[PDB]
Amino acid sequence: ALRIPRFSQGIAQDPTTRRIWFGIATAHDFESHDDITEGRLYQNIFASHFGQLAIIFLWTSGNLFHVAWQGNFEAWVQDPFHVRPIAHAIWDPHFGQPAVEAFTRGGALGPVNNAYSGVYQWWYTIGLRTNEDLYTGAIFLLFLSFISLLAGWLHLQPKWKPSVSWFKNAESRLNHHLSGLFGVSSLAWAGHLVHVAIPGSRGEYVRWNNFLDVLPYPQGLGPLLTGQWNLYAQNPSSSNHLFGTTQGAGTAILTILGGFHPQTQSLWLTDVAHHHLAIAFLFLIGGLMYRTNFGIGHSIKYILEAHIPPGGRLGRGHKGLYDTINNSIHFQLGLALASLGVITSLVAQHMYSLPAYAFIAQDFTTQAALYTHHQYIAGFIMTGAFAHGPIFFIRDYNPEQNADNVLARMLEHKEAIISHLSWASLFLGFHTLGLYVHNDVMLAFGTPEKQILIEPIFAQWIQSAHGKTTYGFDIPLSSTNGPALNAGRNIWLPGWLNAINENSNSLFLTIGPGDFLVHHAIALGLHTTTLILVKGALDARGSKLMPDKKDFGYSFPCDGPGRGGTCDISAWDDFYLAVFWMLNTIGWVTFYWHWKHITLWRGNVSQFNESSTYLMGWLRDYLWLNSSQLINGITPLVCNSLSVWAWMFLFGHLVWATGFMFLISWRGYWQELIETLAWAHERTPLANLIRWRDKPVALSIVQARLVGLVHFSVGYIFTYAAFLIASTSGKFG
Amino acid sequence: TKRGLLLKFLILGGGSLLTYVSANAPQDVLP
């Protein structure tokens, strides 16, 4: 009975073990816990995530540092034929002598595990090459990632201001950012690819010495400032190239010309840079849009205020949405989350069919454990997005200060909102599930015919108005000619966005009734996932069963029995509940690519065709076909190729399963036998006097909804992790 | 039994010599 944990107080002298856990998970909840002021808080998240950027460079450093002395590079830049790159040297005293067996991989000596991260095709893909020429990485990044901490402190120290009110502007900042930052952050990149990298790519080297002496051309930046740009794009690259060594090189940066190549897919050298350039006006033109003292531009209210498009004469306000998104900091961290969430997948769904790297897909592995760590996350976000915009409504938010006002009304006219959401799911439910059992009752029954199977019309459709010059077909005004574009032609859509069917890597894969289902079952996910998040959110405030559900809103998990019987009805426990469908969409979706890809590689595609129009088969051939390789890899007949993976994959099945306790257990039963099990010690010799300092208890009644989860999840996410890899690697594909 | 400030000493010392030479070895007898 002492005093400890240095921030909270109720927690601080709690005699049990909760003392501990609950310490290590209130840490990051600054807004309202003992130590806090709107001045403290802000800054107490500011030199926090200056403790950020900081940890991202001790990551990246080492990424570039288990690579430069071993982990082939003055290899894999001799020609990157699909045989086993390298991350770092695996070193565990537990290893048998089958240290010698693959695991120990060709070129390098002691065993290793190879880059499935992309890095290896972008530390390369912006030039960066020679193994005497290379061994920087940490050296910079780290003589960086320390500065990252220095402000941390410097701006933590009172004196040379850490800044307090100055944290609620906007206009100034974001009038700064989406110019200063992004724009010049682009530009400056536009800078680099182009002086040092494009040359390193098609052309030749750049010597650490010269930087003036090197000149993409003979006669310099020539005109350029001379508004004359055009004659960049003429004989830029070629195709009889031999990538990295000129000869069919040519040297005129920028283009949109040429296109694909059996020797590398990947966006052309230049284009990723006029682009990087091209956008870099718009944001700079964008930056400079709001005030910042001088007296031009805009006040970020007065163009909301009575702005409003369909408002005007439709009795529906718009009051200080600013001093509520601004005075909120949660609205903030969740318009932040999403955008990122929506774009984390736009990143990672565009990063295929348009990978921008020197050998990638036509690698087909790294390409398939990289769409997903960007599908996981991304889904993983979205949720958190939807989860800090059900905290705004409780800790912050202010009914008297927002009302008639369109954030309200959103609350007010809410019962419909979840319903006309739930009506989507229930429909999107049984209607997907008619089509998929029916499709599985009919096979098995002997009749492959009778199979219900809708072509994905409005899909392929989008693409016969693009480039899917699949087996002809007019379309009324289009035909496949007469009118073509007329207004467009030999500019713009040249060889590019002209991959067509390309059974190998055409960008667009040629869609049929197999895809008119998964595609309706990723749609039944974000819908259901969000009726619950929408709902979760749309009353962390309260409702009929719990009317006054607040002053704490979020995680108050549980309530007394009676009323109807009340439970996981904190907006957290709907978040809690949400995260299962974000873990079931972000699976149908990922699941889908791969089966597709797999088949669309070292073999067929008919496979996904008549064998994804049903369900059993999704389990049989895929799931059951294509694990083969891995599991007979501990085999009764010695450790063969993979062993990390399969043991992971069962580590996968345990961490999972062992969720369930947490999940079907519920503190009551646990605590009580610990009541009997803490009559032991006290009553047994050679283990008496011997005092705990934390009172044996069973986990909190929210805590274990988490832990089963934060457990359900790794298992699950650590199983596909090891599943796909452990089978996109073998193949066959 | 001079315990008057110690343990930090025996956890660099003892545990840098149950692990310094304890891992290293002049000619493997490998994993």
């Binding site: 002492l2 400890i4 070193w91 | 956890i11 692990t19 304890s22 891992a23 290293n24």
Partner: peptide, 30 residues
């Protein structure tokens, strides 16, 4: 001497832990 770079798994994966499991038993007391 020949073949000897094995200390940055115990000092880390072993001894660094010793420190903090000891040390951080500061949560209990100091």
């Amino acid at each position: 001497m020949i073949n000897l770079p094995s200390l940055f798994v115990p000092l880390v994966g072993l001894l660094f832990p010793a420190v903090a499991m000891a040390s951080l038993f500061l949560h209990v007391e100091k």
